[PDB]
Amino acid sequence: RAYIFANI
Amino acid sequence: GPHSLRYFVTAVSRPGLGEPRYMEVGYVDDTEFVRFDSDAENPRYEPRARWMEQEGPEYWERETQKAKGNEQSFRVDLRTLLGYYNQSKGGSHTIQVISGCEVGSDGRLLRGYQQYAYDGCDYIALNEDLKTWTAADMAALITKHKWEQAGEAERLRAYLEGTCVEWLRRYLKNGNATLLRTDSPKAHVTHHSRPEDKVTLRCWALGFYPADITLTWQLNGEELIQDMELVETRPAGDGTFQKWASVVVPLGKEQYYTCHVYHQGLPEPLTLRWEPP
Amino acid sequence: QKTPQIQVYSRHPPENGKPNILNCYVTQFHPPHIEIQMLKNGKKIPKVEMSDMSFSKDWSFYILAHTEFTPTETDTYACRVKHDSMAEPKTVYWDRDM
């Protein structure tokens, strides 16, 4: 499962 | 030995031609196993190794939406970086991410990866301590500050120590026999002319997996470094790889040179010479 | 911005008259937009497949372009690459010994 990335 | 679950992420803007293109590409130990590509009216997570087909309709449903989510996040992210770098609206730009865990055979986390890059240059990354950030410039310092005040490092740490490790274990149980596969190289030497009294001997290795391999030419004893020529290992395109290394020897002396092929699938290194029929 | 490395090679050792596969392996480039043609005797090969795009630990992109072909004694094949890092396109001819 891929991480749910944060906005930069 | 150790294993790793990594995600390769790409977001590529392309003004006045359409939405940015987004991809999530999954890797268990350098083998790609999942891919998502936003170029489609109804884009979907896909299996890229046969053993992944074991996962149920729900797994793909769940991943697909998550990626779709991620994509939208990166659409904003591209717009944001233009704001940070003060760049004009019409350029194509690229965000790249490497995200995942490396776990030992004991099941402990050896190191974690969260590496961001903007236009092929390091942007920000999580330190080995899994708690702080390294930013490559004034722009990323703004992303550092935002992730400090939302405690992003902690949320990431949790994913690395939890979801990442846990799933890498789930994946490994499904595809372990496959990933472990090993194809020994087959080697031949070829002979080619060269102006006058010199000839080229070329030592080939073909049909091997994985890609790691070492080819060396020896003369009467010691190895040939300074003059030897080789190419980057390259895919045959059927899952195997290929490579060669060659050396310019005196005409009539070919039989005095030995090629050694070193690969992990070999009971022992291969030794061969040029064989004139 | 990074200039692409090109390799043109067949999948199996070439043998005149026997079908094989010609590979164009393009690596080390950036940005990820690239145009890859394969030419036969100067003319564009119409049906060329591309692997999905990927990149490496150092951020650079790679892709494998391949086409079905039957090597002759005299046919010349090449791979041609357009990419923003280069003022002009880059052609590499297939060498069967290589």
Author numbering:
A (entry chain M): 1 to 8
B (entry chain A): 1 to 277
C (entry chain B): 2 to 99
Share the article's original sentences.
A second subdominant CTL epitope, S598 (H-2Kb-restricted, RCQIFANI, spanning residues 598–605 of the S glycoprotein) also elicits an appreciable CTL response; however, S598-specific CTL exhibit ∼100-fold lower functional avidity and do not protect from CTL escape in S510. We modified epitope S598 (S598Q600Y) such that it elicited a high-avidity CTL response and using the crystal structures of the H-2Kb/S598 and H-2Kb/S598Q600Y complexes, determined the basis of this enhanced immune response. As we have previously observed with other MHC/Cys-containing peptide complexes, complexes did not readily form unless the cysteine of the S598 peptide (RCQIFANI) was modified with L-α-aminobutyric acid (Aba, an isostereomer of cysteine). We also performed structural analyses and showed that enhanced immunogenicity was associated with changes in the conformations of both the peptide and the region of the MHC class I molecule that is in close association with the peptide.
Therefore, we substituted a glutamine residue for tyrosine (Q600Y, CAA to TAT, RCYIFANI) at position 3 of the determinant with the aim of creating a peptide that bound more tightly to H-2Kb. The structure of H-2Kb/S598Q600Y consists of four heterodimers in the asymmetric unit (rmsd of 0.09 Å for heavy chain (HC) Cα's), the four copies of the peptide adopting virtually identical conformations (rmsd of 0.12 Å for all peptide atoms and 0.05 Å for Cα atoms). S598Q600Y displays the same conformation as the S598 determinant (the average rmsd for peptide Cα atoms between the two structures is 0.24 Å) and forms equivalent interactions with the MHC. In contrast to Gln-3, the Tyr-3 side chain is oriented towards the α-2 helix rather than the floor of the cleft. In particular, changes in the conformation of Ser-99, Gln-114, and Gly-151-Glu-154 are associated with the bound peptides. Changes in the side chain conformations of Ser-99 and Gln-114 in the Q600Y complex structure are consistent with the loss of hydrogen bonding interactions with position 3. Most strikingly, the Q600Y change resulted in subtle changes in the conformation of the α-2 helix locally in the vicinity of Glu-152. These subtle changes are likely critical for the enhanced TcR recognition that we detected. Replacement of the Gln-3 with Tyr-3 (Q600Y) did, indeed, result in an determinant with increased thermostability without diminishing the CD8 T cell response. S598Q600Y elicited a response with higher functional avidity to both the cognate and native determinants than S598, and this was not reflected in differential Vβ usage.
